[PDB]
Every structure is written in structure tokens, then in C-alpha cells.
Design a protein around this ligand. Sequence first.
Ligand SMILES: Nc1ncnc2c1ncn2[C@@H]1O[C@H](COP(=O)(O)OP(=O)(O)OP(=O)(O)O)[C@@H](O)[C@H]1O
Ligand SMILES: Nc1ncnc2c1ncn2[C@@H]1O[C@H](COP(=O)(O)OP(=O)(O)OP(=O)(O)O)[C@@H](O)[C@H]1O
Ligand SMILES: [Mg+2]
Ligand SMILES: [Mg+2]
Ligand code: NA
Ligand code: NA
Lengths: 307, 306
Amino acid sequence: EECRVLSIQSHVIRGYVGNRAATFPLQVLGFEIDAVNSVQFSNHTGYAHWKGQVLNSDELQELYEGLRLNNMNKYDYVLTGYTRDKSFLAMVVDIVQELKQQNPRLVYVCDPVLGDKWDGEGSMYVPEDLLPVYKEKVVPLADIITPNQFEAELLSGRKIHSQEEALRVMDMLHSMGPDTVVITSSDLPSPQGSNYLIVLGSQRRRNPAGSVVMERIRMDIRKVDAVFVGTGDLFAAMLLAWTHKHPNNLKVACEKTVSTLHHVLQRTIQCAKAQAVRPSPMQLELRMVQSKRDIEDPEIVVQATVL
Amino acid sequence: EECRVLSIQSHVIRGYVGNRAATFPLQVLGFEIDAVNSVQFSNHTGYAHWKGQVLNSDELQELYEGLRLNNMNKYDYVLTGYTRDKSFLAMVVDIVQELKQQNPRLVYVCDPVLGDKWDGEGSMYVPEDLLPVYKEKVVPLADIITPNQFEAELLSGRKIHSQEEALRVMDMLHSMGPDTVVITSSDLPSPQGSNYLIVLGSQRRGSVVMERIRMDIRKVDAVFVGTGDLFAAMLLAWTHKHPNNLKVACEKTVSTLHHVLQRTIQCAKAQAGEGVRPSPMQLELRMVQSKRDIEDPEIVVQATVL
Ligand SMILES: Nc1ncnc2c1ncn2[C@@H]1O[C@H](COP(=O)(O)OP(=O)(O)OP(=O)(O)O)[C@@H](O)[C@H]1O
Ligand SMILES: Nc1ncnc2c1ncn2[C@@H]1O[C@H](COP(=O)(O)OP(=O)(O)OP(=O)(O)O)[C@@H](O)[C@H]1O
Ligand SMILES: [Mg+2]
Ligand SMILES: [Mg+2]
Ligand code: NA
Ligand code: NA
């Protein structure tokens, strides 16, 4: 038995973002993940310097023809994240369409990377003309999506000020296409204090009996004093892995996903501090490799609230 | 404690060869390996088809520049394998010289891929103009080299017909520079039967001792791709953990390959059915499913000290 994933994301030489944050973890859990590298840079763009090349829609299509010609275009999952250009994204959409025709049971996990917000206001970090494509072509095709608060607000067109508006926006997202919507981070208020970020998740599904039900959860995570890159990619990847293992249990899938990132960042936070005192982007690269054990079976450190 | 490896080799979307065969195993064993993909192809060339793009020498330098500007050009090991381009390989050389000045203790593991021999006749599968660069530029720089028999013959200029000629040749290789030379496969005959392939290893290491070892590996009925790359990467990992113990390091390298292929050849057959010969697709290494065998391979081959 084998579960095949096609992950189209960026590659870097040094560090863990994109395909570099998604691949090792999924491989450790038994997945035959195939990495299509949308770009190859020396490191992520949060560093003072970075150089590299990008893959264009033509080349992505060639890579695909190669696979198709060998009749190797049969996947169980497809996984996308940061996509920098409309032309590429329209191509990723054509590829997902054909893979779904090839296999109707294919699950498309899509991280709709658009931007994020810093201390109150958010701004986009991909071309604005990608939003219409995400709205009309990509999300309708998705089975699981992992937007942060900023991205859900752009996808739904509604600002989110409360948990209830969050739920309403999540329902809106469900109606665009995906049965699983997880808001990966938000500045919603927590009763635990203000040094907490909020994760919300909602999954629609049919039970053996055949009724269409919805599981909803919330997690209040304590904030770590640092900026990490790649953890959004890691979140989407682990979510793929754990909903795959616990299909009818969003609570457990999310707790394992959020617990894995917690163990990775705790281990990362330790070494960052030891090597420094104000850690640079380099010292803050996720301690991926050293976290093998926590990825394989993470001790659950945060229980979710049931909504 | 961290050990960084810069691995420059090919990437495929489907399968395991190059950085694909070298990365996961080394990550599993705790290495901070950075993969520079010399190419990005849909799959390896053993298939009916393949499409893809290549990385040029200028792009390689660009990537290296980025790392340097950030003071990220400090590594414990460099690993390179199949390159089909002379300009690209010269750039790898300039890069390895550079990383060595930055860290004199850097260990360069070079798999000098030039070709192989099929039934007895060997044929190159890299342009000829590479050989001069390898003999004159690459090998003198290398600390560990992993050539198969054909490559050891091409690199030394001598034909190998016996275990003694082989070790004679490994010695010529040590003189070109490398302290550890391992011949990853040869047609030498084994006392165990015709169904065996021979691996020979030699390491030079205030005494100047010489350790030499041989292993008799049981041939498996099928042609795999990426096993040479896996061999070089696992050798780097094990030489790293058992430093002056060529014997143990080769034992774990080869045992690991054995489990992976045993596991691979089994699903191969399962998917091809009784009597039918597995395709390249079916024969792709079962990498991910061999995680446990990579972390701690059960030793199933003892090396003989020559
Ligand atoms: N500073 C932090 N402190 C604590 N946990 C964090 C921190 N940064 C990230 N995380 C963890 O990473 C997860 C996802 O957050 P992150 O902000 O990195 O991505 P995002 O903006 O939600 O996603 P994207 O833009 O990739 O779709 C959190 O929900 C949490 O589990
Ligand atoms: N058909 C096979 N049967 C049994 N073991 C094999 C077979 N093919 C490869 N191996 C294993 O793979 C290892 C390396 O062998 P392989 O022939 O693939 O590379 P090579 O020709 O020595 O290397 P390179 O071309 O990368 O310089 C062997 O030494 C052995 O452990
Ligand atoms: Mg964020
Ligand atoms: Mg061979
Ligand atoms: Na997200
Ligand atoms: Na070899």
C-alpha cells in the first residue's frame, strides 16, 4: 500500500520553507511525496540576501508531460503553497484538473498564500491578480485549504473581528469548494491572554449513515517571541498527513498537527537562543531533521476546544 | 551539534536517483543536508521518456553567491555525483576549493560517475571531455571517492582483472589525492558463486596505516537506478559515525542497500506478477519504506580484511 503526493512548492538550498518544510516530514510518515520545485533559491527571502531561479509555466508543463508520457500521473494527493505568478497558478490548476479526472478520489490540499498581517494591518506578498484565480479557479478545486486570518478575509471578502465572524467566513469558504477549512493563525482574542494566537478548523463530511455533518474546533496557541518562516508550509503538510490518518476526526488531526509544530519550534527556539541576543533568520531555521521523532508521533501538548 | 552536507546532484519528480536517493537517508541519520539540484527531470533516463530542465554553471554560481553573501558557505561535507557537463563540473571544483579555504576540515565525497560495464564491455555515459577534468581537477580535491570498476579503470588508466590489480589501482587513486577509495561494484569472481559482486575498500590514515577490505555481495536479478548515489551518501554517513573503521562503515552501507533492495525487489514482483519482469517504474527504490533500515541496518554482510 502506497499514498502518493505531488507537492509543487519552492525549494531552497539552505533552510526549511516550501518543499523543504513539507517533504522530509511527509517522507518520515510513509508518504511517497514527489516534489516539483517551483523555484530554487539559496535561502528564503527573509534573509538580507537571496539569489536563485524560478520555474515558469512552460517548464512546469514539460515536467508534467514527462510524468504523463510515462503514465505516472496518478496521485492520491496534490499539495500547493506559495505560488508567485498567475501564469504558474493557472498551470497548477490545469494539472490538478487532469489529475482529478485520472483519479476522482484525489485530495487537493491547497495553502492559498496571499499575504499576512503584521501588528494590525496586513498586506499581500504575491501579485494581486492571483486573488481572482484563487477565488474562481483554485479554491473551487480544493478539498482542504489552510488560510491564515488575512487570507480567509481576502478570499471571502469579509473582515474577521470575532470568532463568530470567523465561523461565518469559514462557511463561506466551504461553499466555494473545500470540505476542510483550517484558519492557521489569527489575532482573535483569547481568554488565556494576549500572547496567544488562534487556530480554527471546520470539516464537513458524510458519516457511514450518510448524513452530512460538520466538526468545528478551536485551539489557543501561546505565541513564541520570534518570526519563523516555513511553519505555514509545515502546518499544511502535517494537516494532509494527519487528516489522512484520522479522516473523521478533525480534532485529533489538528491537535497532532499543532503539537508537531510546537515541538519543532521549541527545539528551534532553544538552539536559536544558544547560538546567539536577537536570533537572525539563519539561527531560526526550523530544526527539522532533529525533530524526526516528534513528527512520527507527537506527544499532544494542546487539546482543542470543541465548537 | 550539527553536520552540514552540500549535495550537488540531480533531482527527479518521480523516483529516487541523485539528490532524491541521497537526501532522505542522510536527513533520517541527522544530517543538515542542503541539496543543490543540478537538474530537475520528470524521472530518470532509464524510462521510455523523460522531460526536464538543467542548471547551468552560471546559475550554480548564482546560488553559491547567495549562500556566501549570508555567510552560509561553511560546510562539513560536500557530495557530488553524476554531472554530464564539463563547465558545470569545473564550477563545482571552484566551489569545493572555496569551501575548503573556508573550512580546511571539509570532507569532499566524490562519486566520479563516467559509465559502467554491461556484460563485460564497459561504455561511458558522460561526454569524454569529463575524464580529464575528473583526473586532473576533481579527484585531487576529493577525500573519499566511490567509483565502480569501470570508473576506477578509466581514472587510473589501467584494466583490472583481479583483486590484486584492483588494489594496485586503488593505490594509484590514493596517490592522485583521495584517502578513502571504495570500488562500489566489480566483475571480480567470488568464492561464493557466480551470483556475487565484489566491493573493495581502501583507506589511508603518527603512523600512516592502510586498512583494506572486501565484501562479497549477492547479485539480485534486476537493474536499479540510484543505488550508486545511495551507496555514496550512506558511505559518507557511516564513515562519519565510525571515523577510522572502514570495515564497519562499509558493512552498514552495504547492509542498508541490501535491505532497501530486498524490500524493493519484493514489491516489484508483487506489482509485476509471477513470471513477469518488473519495469523501471516498479523497480524504483522503496526509499521511504526503508526508514528503519537506514537508521540502524541489521548487518547481513561481514567484510573481509585484506
Ligand atoms: N511566533 C509563533 N509562536 C507560536 N507558534 C507559531 C509562531 N509562528 C508560527 N507558529 C505555528 O505555526 C502555525 C501556522 O502559523 P504561520 O503564521 O507561520 O502561518 P500562517 O500565516 O498561518 O500561514 P500561510 O501564509 O503559509 O498560509 C501556527 O498556527 C502555529 O501552530
Ligand atoms: N543488481 C544488484 N544486485 C545486488 N546488489 C546490487 C545490484 N545493483 C546494485 N546493488 C548494490 O548497489 C551498490 C552500488 O552499485 P551500482 O552498480 O548501482 O553502482 P556502481 O555502478 O558501483 O556506481 P556509480 O555509477 O554511481 O559510480 C552495490 O555495491 C550493491 O551494494
Ligand atoms: Mg503567518
Ligand atoms: Mg553499476
Ligand atoms: Na496558513
Ligand atoms: Na559508484
